[PDB]
Coordinates of C-alpha atoms and ligand atoms in Angstrom, one line a residue:
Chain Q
X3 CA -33.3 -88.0 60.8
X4 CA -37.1 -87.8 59.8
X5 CA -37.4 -91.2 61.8
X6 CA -35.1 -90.0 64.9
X7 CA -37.2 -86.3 65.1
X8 CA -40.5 -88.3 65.8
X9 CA -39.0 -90.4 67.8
X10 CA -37.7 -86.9 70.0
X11 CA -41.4 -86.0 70.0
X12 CA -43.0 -89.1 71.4
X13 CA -40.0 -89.4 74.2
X14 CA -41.3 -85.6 74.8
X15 CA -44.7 -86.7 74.8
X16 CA -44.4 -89.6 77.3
X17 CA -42.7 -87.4 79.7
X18 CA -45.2 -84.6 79.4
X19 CA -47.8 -87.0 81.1
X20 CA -45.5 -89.0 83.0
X21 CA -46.4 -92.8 81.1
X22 CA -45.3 -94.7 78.8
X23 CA -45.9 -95.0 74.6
X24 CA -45.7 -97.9 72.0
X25 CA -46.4 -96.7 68.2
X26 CA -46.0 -98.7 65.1
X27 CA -46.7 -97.4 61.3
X28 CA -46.9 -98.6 58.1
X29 CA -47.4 -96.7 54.9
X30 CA -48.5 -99.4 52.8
X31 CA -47.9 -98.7 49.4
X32 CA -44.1 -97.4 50.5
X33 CA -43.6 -99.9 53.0
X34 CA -42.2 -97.4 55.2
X35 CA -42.2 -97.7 58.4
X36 CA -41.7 -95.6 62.1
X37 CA -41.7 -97.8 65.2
X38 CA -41.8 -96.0 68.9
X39 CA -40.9 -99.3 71.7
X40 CA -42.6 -100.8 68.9
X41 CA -40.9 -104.3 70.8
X42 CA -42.2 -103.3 74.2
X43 CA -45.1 -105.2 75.4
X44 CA -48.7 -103.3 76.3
X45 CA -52.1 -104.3 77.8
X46 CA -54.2 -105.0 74.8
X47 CA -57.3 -103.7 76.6
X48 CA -60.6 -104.2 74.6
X49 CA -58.2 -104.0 71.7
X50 CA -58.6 -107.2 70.8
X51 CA -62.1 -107.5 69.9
X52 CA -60.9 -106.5 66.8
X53 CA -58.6 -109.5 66.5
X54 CA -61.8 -111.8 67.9
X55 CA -64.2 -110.2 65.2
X56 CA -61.5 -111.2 62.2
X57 CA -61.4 -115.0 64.1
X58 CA -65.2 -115.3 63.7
X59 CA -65.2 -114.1 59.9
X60 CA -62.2 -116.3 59.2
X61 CA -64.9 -119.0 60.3
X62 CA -67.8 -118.0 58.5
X63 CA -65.3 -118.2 55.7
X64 CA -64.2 -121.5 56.3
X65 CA -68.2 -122.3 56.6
X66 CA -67.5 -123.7 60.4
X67 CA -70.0 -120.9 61.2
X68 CA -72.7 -118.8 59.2
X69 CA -73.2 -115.1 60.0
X70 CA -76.7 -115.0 60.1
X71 CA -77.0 -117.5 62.5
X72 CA -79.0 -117.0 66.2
X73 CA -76.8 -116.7 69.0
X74 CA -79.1 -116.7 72.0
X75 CA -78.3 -116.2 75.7
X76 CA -82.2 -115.3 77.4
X77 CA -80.5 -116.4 80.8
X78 CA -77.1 -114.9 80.6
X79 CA -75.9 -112.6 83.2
X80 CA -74.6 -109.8 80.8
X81 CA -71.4 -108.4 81.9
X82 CA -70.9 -104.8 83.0
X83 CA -70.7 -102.5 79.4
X84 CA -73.0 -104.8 77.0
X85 CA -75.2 -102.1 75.8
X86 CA -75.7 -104.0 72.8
X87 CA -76.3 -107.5 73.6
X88 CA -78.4 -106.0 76.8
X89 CA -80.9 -104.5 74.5
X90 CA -81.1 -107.9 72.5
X91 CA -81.0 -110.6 75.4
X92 CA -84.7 -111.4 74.7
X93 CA -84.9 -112.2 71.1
X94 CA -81.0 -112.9 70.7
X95 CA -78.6 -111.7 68.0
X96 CA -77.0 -112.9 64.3
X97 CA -73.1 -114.2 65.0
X98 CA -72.2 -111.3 62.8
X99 CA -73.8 -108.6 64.5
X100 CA -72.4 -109.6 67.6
X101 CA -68.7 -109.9 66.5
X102 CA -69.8 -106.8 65.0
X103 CA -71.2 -105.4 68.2
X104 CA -67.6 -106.8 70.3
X105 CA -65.7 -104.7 67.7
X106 CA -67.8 -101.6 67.4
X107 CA -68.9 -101.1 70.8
X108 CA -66.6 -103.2 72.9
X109 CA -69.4 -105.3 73.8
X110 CA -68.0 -107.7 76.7
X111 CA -71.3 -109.9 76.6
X112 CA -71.0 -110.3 72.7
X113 CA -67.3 -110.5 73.6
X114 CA -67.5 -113.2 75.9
X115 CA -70.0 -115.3 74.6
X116 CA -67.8 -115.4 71.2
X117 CA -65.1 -116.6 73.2
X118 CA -67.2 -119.3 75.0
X119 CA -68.8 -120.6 72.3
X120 CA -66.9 -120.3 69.2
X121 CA -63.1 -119.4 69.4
X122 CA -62.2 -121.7 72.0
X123 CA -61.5 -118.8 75.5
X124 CA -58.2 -117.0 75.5
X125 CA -56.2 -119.9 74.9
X126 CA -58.1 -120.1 71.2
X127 CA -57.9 -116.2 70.5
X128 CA -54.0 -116.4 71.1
X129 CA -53.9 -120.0 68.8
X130 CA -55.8 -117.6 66.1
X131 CA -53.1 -114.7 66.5
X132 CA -50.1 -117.5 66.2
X133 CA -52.2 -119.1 63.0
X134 CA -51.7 -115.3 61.5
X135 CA -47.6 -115.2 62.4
X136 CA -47.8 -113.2 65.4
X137 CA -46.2 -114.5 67.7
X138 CA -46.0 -111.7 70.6
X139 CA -50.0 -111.2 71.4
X140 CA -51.1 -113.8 74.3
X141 CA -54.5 -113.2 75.8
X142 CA -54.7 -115.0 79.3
X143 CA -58.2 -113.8 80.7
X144 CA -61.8 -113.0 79.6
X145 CA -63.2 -109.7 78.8
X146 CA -63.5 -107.9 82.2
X147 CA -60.5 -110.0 83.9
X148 CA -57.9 -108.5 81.6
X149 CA -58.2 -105.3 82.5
X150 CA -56.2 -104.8 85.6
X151 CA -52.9 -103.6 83.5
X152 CA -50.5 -104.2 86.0
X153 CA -46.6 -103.0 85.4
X154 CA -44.4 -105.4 84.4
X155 CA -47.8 -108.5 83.6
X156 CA -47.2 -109.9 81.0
X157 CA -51.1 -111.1 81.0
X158 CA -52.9 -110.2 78.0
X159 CA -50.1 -108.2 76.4
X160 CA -49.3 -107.8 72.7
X161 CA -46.5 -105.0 71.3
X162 CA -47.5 -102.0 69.2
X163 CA -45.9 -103.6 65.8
X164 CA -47.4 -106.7 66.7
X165 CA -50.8 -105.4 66.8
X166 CA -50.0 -103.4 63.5
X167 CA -48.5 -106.3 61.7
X168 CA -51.4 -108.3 62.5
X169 CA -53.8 -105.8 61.4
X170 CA -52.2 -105.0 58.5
X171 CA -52.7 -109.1 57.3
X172 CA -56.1 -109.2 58.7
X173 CA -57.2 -105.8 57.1
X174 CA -55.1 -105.5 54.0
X175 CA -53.6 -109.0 53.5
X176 CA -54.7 -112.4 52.5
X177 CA -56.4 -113.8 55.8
X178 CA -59.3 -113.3 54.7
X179 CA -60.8 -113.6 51.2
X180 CA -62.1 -110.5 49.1
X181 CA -66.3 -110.6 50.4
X182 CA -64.6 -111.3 54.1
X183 CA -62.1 -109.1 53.9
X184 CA -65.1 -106.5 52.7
X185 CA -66.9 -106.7 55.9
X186 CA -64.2 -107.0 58.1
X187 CA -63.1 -103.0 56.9
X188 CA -67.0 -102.2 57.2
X189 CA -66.9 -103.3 61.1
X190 CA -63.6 -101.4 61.9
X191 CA -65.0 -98.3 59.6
X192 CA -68.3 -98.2 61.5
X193 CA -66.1 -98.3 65.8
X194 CA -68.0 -96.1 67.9
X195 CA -65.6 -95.4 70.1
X196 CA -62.4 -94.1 68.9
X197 CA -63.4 -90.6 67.7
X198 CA -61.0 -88.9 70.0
X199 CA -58.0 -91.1 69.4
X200 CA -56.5 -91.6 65.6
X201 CA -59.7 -90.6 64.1
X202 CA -58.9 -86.8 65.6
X203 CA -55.1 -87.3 64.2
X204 CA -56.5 -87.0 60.6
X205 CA -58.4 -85.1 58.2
X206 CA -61.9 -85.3 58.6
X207 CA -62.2 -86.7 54.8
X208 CA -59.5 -89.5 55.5
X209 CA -61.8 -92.7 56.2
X210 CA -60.6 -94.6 59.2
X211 CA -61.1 -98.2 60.8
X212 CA -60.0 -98.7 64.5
X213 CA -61.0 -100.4 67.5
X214 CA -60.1 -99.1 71.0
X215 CA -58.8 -100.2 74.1
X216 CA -59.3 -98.3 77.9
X217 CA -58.2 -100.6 80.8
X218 CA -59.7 -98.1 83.4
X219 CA -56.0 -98.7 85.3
X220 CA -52.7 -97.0 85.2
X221 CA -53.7 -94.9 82.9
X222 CA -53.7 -97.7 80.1
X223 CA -55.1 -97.1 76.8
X224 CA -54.6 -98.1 73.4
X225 CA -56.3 -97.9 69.1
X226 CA -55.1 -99.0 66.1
X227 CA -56.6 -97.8 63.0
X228 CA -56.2 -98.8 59.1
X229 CA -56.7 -95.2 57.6
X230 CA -57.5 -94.5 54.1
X231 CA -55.9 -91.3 52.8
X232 CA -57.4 -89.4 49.8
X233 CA -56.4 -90.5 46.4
X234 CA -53.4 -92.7 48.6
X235 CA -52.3 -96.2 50.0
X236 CA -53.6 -97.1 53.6
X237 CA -52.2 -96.3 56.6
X238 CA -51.7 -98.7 59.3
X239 CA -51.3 -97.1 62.9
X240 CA -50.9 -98.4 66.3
X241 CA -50.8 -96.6 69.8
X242 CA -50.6 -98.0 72.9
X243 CA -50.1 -96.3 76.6
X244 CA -49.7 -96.9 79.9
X245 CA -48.8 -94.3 82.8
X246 CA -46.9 -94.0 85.9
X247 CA -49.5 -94.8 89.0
X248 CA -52.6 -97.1 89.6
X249 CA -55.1 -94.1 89.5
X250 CA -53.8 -92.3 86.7
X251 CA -56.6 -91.5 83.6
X252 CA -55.8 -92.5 80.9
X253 CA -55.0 -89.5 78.0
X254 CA -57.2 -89.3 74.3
X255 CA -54.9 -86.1 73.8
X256 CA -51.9 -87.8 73.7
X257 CA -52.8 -91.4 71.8
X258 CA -54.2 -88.7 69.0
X259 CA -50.8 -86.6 69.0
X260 CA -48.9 -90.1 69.2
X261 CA -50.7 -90.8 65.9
X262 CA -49.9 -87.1 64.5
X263 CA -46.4 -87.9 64.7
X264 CA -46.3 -91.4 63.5
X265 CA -48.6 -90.5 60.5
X266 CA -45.7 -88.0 59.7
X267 CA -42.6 -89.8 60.6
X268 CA -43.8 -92.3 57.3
X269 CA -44.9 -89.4 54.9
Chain Z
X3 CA -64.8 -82.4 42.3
X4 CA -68.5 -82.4 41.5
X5 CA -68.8 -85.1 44.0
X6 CA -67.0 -83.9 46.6
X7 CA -69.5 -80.7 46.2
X8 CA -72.5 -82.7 46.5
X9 CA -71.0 -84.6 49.5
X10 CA -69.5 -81.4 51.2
X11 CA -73.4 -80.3 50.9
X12 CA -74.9 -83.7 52.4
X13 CA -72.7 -83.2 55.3
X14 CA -73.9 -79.7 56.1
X15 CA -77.3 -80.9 55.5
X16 CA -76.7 -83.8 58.1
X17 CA -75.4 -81.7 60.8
X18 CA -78.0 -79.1 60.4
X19 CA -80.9 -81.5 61.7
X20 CA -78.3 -83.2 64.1
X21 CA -78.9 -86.6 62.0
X22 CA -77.8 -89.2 59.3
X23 CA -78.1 -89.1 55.6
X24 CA -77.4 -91.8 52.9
X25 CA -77.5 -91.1 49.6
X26 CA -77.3 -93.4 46.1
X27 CA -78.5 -92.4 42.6
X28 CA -78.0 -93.7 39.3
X29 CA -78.5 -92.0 35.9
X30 CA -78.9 -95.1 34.0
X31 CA -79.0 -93.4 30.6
X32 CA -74.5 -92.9 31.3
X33 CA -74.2 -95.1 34.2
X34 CA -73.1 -92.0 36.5
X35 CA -73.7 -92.6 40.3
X36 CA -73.5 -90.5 43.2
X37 CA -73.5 -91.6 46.7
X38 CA -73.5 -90.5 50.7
X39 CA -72.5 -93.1 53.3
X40 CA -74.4 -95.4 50.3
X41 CA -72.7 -98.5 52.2
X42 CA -73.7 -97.7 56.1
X43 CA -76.8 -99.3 57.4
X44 CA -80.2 -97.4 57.6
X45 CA -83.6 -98.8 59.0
X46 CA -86.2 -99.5 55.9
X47 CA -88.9 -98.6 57.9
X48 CA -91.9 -99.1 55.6
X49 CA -89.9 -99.0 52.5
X50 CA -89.7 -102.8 52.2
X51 CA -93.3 -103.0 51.4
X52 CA -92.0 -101.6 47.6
X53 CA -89.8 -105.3 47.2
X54 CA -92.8 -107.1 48.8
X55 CA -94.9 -106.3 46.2
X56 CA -92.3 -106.7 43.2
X57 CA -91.6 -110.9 44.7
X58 CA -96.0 -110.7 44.6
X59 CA -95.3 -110.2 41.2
X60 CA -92.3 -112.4 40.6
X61 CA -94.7 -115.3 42.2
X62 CA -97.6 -114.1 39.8
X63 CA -94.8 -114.1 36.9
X64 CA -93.7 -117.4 37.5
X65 CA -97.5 -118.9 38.0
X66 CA -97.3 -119.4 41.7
X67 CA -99.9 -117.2 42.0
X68 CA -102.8 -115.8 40.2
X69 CA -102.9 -112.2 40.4
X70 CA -106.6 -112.0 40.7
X71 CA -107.1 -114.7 43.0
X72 CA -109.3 -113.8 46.0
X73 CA -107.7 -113.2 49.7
X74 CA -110.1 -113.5 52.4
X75 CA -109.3 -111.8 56.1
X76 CA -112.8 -112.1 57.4
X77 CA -111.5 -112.7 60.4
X78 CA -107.8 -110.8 60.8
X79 CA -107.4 -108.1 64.0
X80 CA -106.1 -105.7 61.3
X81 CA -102.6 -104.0 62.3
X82 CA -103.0 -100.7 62.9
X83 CA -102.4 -98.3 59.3
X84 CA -104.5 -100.7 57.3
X85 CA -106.9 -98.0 55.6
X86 CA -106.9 -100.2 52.5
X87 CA -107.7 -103.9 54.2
X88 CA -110.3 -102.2 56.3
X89 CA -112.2 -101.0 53.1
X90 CA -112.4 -104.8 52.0
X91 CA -112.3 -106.9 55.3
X92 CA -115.9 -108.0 54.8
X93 CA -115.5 -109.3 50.9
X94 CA -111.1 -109.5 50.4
X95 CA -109.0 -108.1 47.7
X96 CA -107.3 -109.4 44.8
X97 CA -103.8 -110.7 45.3
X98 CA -103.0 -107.4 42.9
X99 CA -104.8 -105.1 44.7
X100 CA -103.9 -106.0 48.1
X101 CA -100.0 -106.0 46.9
X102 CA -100.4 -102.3 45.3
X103 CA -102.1 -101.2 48.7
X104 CA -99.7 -102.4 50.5
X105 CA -96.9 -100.4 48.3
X106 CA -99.1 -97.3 48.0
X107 CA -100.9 -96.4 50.9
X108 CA -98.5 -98.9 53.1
X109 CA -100.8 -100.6 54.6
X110 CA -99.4 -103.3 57.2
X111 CA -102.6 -105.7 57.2
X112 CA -101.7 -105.9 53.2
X113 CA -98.1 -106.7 54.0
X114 CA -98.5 -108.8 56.8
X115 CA -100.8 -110.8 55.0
X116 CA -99.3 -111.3 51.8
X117 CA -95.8 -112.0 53.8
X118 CA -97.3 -114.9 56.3
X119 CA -99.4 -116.6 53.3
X120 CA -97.3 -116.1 50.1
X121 CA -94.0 -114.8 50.7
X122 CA -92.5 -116.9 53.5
X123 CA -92.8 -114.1 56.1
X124 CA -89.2 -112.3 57.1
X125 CA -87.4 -115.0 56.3
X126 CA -88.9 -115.2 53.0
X127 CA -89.1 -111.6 51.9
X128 CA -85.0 -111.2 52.6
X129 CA -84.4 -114.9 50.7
X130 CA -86.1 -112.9 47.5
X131 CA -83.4 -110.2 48.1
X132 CA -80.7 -112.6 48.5
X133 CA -82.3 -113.8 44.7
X134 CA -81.7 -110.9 43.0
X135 CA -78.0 -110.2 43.8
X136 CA -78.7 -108.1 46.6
X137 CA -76.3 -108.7 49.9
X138 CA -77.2 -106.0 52.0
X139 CA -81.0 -106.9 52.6
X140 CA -82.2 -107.9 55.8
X141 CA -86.1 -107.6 56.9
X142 CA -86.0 -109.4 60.6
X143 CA -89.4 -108.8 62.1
X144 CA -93.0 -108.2 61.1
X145 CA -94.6 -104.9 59.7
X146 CA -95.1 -103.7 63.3
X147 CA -92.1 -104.7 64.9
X148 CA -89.7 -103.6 62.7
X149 CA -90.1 -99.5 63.5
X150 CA -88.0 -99.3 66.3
X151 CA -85.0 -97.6 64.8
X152 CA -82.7 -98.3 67.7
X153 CA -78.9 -96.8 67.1
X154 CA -77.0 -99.3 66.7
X155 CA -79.2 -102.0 65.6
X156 CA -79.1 -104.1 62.3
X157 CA -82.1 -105.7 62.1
X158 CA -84.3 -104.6 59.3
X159 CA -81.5 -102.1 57.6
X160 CA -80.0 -102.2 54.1
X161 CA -77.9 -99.4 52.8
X162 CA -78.7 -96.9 50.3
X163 CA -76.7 -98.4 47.4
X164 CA -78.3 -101.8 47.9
X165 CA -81.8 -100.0 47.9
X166 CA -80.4 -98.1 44.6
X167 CA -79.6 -101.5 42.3
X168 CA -82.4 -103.6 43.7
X169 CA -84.7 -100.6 42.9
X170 CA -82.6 -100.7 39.4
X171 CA -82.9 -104.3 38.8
X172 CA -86.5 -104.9 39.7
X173 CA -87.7 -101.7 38.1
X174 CA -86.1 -101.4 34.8
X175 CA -84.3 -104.6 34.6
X176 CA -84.9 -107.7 33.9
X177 CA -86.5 -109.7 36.9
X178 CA -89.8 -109.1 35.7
X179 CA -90.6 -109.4 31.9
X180 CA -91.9 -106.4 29.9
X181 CA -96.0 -107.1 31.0
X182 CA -94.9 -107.2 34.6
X183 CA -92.9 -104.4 35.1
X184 CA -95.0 -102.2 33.7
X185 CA -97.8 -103.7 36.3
X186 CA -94.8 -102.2 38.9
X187 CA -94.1 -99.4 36.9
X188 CA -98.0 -98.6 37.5
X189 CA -97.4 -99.2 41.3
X190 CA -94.8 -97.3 41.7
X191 CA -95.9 -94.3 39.8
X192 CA -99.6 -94.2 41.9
X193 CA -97.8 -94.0 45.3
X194 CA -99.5 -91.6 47.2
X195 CA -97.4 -91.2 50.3
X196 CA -94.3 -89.3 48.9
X197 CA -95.2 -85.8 47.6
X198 CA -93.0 -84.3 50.0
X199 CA -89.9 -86.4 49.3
X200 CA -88.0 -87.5 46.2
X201 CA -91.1 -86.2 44.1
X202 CA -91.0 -82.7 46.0
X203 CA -87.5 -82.6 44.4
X204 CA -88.4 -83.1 40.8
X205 CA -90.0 -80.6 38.1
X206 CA -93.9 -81.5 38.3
X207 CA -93.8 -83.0 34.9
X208 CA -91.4 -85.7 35.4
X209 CA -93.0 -89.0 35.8
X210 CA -92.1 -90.4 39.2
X211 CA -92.8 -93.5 41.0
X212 CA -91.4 -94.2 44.7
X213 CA -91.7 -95.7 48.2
X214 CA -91.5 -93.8 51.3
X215 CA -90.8 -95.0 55.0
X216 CA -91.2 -93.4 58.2
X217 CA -90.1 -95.5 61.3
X218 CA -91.4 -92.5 63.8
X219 CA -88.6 -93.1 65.9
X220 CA -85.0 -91.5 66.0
X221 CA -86.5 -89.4 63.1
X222 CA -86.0 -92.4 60.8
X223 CA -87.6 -91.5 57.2
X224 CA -86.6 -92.6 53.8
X225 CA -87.8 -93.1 50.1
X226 CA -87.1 -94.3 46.9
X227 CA -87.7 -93.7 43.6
X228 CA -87.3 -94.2 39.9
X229 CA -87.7 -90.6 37.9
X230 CA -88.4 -90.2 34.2
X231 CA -87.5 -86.9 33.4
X232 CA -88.9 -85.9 29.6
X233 CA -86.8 -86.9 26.7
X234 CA -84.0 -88.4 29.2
X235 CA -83.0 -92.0 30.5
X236 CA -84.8 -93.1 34.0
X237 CA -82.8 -91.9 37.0
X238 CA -82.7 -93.5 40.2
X239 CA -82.9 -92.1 43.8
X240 CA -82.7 -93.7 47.4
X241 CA -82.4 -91.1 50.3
X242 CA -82.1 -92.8 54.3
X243 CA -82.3 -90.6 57.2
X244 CA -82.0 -91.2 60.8
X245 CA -81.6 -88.5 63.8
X246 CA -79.5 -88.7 67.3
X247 CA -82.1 -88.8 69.6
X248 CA -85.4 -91.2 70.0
X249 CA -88.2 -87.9 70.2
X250 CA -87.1 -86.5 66.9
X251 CA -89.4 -85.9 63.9
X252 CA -88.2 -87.2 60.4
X253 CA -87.6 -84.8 58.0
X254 CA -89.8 -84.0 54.6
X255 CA -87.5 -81.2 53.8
X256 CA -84.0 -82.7 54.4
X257 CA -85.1 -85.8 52.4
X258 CA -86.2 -83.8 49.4
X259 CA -82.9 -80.8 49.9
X260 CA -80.9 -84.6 49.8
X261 CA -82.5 -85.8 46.6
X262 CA -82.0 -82.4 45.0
X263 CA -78.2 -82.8 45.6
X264 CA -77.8 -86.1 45.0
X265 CA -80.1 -85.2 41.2
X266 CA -77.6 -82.6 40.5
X267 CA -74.5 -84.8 41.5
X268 CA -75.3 -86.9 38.5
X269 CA -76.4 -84.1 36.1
Ligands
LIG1 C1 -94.1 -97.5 57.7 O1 -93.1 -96.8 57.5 C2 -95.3 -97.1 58.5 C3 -96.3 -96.4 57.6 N1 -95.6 -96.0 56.3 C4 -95.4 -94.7 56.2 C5 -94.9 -94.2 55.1 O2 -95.1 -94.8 54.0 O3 -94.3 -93.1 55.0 C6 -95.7 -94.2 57.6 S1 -96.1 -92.4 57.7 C7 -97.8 -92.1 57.0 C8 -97.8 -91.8 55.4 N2 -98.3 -90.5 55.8 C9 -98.5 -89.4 55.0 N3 -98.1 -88.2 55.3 C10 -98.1 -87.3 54.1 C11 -99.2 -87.8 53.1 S2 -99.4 -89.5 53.5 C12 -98.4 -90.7 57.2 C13 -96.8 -95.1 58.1 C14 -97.0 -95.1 59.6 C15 -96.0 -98.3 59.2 C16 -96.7 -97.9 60.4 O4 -95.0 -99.2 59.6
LIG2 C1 -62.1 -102.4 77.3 O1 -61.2 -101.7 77.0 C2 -63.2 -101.9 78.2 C3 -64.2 -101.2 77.4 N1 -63.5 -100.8 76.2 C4 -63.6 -99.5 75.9 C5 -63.1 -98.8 74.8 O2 -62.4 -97.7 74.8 O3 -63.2 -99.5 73.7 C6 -64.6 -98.9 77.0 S1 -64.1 -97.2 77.5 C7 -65.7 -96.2 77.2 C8 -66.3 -96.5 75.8 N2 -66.2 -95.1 75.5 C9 -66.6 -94.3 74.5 N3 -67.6 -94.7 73.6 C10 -68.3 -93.5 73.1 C11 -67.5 -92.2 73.2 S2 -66.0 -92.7 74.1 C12 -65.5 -94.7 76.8 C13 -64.7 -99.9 78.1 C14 -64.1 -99.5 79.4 C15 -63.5 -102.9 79.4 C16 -63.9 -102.3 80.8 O4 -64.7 -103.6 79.1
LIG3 CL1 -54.9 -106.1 78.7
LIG4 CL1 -66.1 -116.9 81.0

């Protein structure tokens, strides 16, 4: 009845501003769990930058790639919101800052340019996802493509437990060794753009890792978030949205009330 | 709990002058640290020039170099803050001399000099990092170059901790032996361009030795330092500030008010 009283809030929730939300949440140390359409699909979004920044350390792991190496791209026509890799285009940037740079400020040059040159396109970000068991997230198009978040496209979808399940083995898990793993919770600690989404849902001394998602369309917007709790076992959250009509904005408000009531459904 | 003070009083401290602060200090006489966002990145500014002239001395130690061995510039466009060099343009320095200027007055003909001839430039100076256990290390771009400060970027950053235990392990450690060290301890202790930082924090009778930074950008300052308080163990102290916006000025005050903290922290 703890489970079925969140779920009563979110349904309220989605009807308050007329959309649609997806929550999943693990307390990791309990293993409990409250899911919200936590089976329904979503558009990732940016969201999966994160997803592409773990794919590039799970090289430099493997020693395919080294972090420090120059990725230069003098001649590239950088893609609308690259204020990172604009301000570098003349001298270039390590492969670590710019995965770091796709996660942390939704970089769609550094984004792109990954995905070009390193993970193989969309086809090779989804082949990562399947390589980590999950077997629901598909991206189809590149960064500024996938963004149209059209009902019922199933184009660059994942689901809410999905995404949580994923980054629960990619944050938490074995994926990634210890050193990896290390700078992998450093990236997602250090997003810059998520302060009004699950970082808002928690105390200010919690520390949290997230990376966002805001389609610009139907309302569609999405984070998911690792959270370290005070003297506790992490958190894993996960909210995605989606609203009614084409023009609709999407709603910070209620992705960091989603999170509220997820974080408490598991307590 | 007496953490959490000392953090609760960084944090008001930070928002005060609208800014960044990270902290990391040692008491190596119990091995009781306190730190402030001691893994985030912060510019080193200047403050490199203090590791620069510890691998001089690592190179002297090892007999790649003669520590009174003439350099000759006769010829150099000196960088601008070079009041040392441009004393001695017309006759050179000694290797030593020309190291210890570069650490106490932080003059960028002396580094630039001593990085393109002895040290392997950039490159170099980050690979002697690497050498003594520290990760975190980068120096990307000459002594000129590197002041920019830009939000967001990596290049030439550690983090306070790093800056801590490399301070640690070069100054009281073991990468020099007991003749060399206390050439460094020397260096350190005559550095003239930190009386209203770390030192500004200390009772006047403590024996201190530091380096300071100030990118003059983004209000970007820092300094470290190893204290010597009378009849007590050394203590060791790495304050990093940045600021939000590019015009600001860096902070004498709020480096000192975070040293006194961070001091008491580890009383
Ligand atoms: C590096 O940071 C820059 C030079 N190093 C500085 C420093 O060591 O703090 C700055 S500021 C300079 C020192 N100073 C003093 N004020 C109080 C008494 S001495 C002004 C300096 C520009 C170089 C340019 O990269
Ligand atoms: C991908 O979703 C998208 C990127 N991703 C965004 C995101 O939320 O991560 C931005 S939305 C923009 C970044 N914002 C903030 N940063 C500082 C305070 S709030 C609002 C952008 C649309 C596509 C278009 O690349
Ligand atoms: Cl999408
Ligand atoms: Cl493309």
């Amino acid at each position: 009845n703890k489970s079925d009283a969140a779920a009563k809030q979110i349904k309220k929730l989605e009807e308050d501003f007329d959309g649609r939300i997806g929550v999943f949440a693990i307390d990791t140390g309990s293993g409990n769990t409250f899911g919200y359409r936590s089976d329904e699909r979503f558009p990732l979004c940016s969201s999966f930058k994160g997803f592409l920044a773990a794919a590039v350390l799970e090289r430099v792991q493997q020693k395919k790639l080294d972090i420090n190496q120059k990725v230069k791209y003098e001649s590239r026509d950088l893609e609308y919101h690259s204020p990172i890799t604009t301000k570098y285009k003349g001298s270039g940037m390590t492969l670590g800052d710019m995965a770091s740079a796709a996660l942390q400020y939704s970089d769609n040059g550094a984004t792109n340019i990954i995905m070009e040159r390193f993970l193989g396109g969309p086809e090779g970000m989804t082949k990562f996802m399947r390589s980590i068991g999950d077997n629901e997230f598909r991206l189809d198009r590149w960064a500024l493509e996938l963004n149209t978040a059209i009902p019922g496209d199933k184009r660059d979808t994942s689901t809410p437990k999905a995404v949580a399940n994923s980054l629960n083995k990619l944050a938490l898990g074995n994926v990634l060794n210890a050193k990896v793993k290390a700078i992998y919770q450093n990236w997602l600690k250090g997003n810059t753009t998520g302060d009004a989404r699950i970082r808002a849902s928690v105390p200010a001394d919690w520390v949290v890792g997230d990376k966002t998602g805001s389609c610009g369309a139907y309302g569609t917007a999405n984070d998911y978030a690792v959270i370290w709790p005070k003297n506790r076992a992490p958190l894993i959250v996960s909210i995605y949205t989606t609203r009614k009509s084409k023009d609709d904005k999407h709603s910070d408000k209620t992705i960091a009330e989603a999170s509220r009531i997820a974080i408490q459904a598991i307590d």
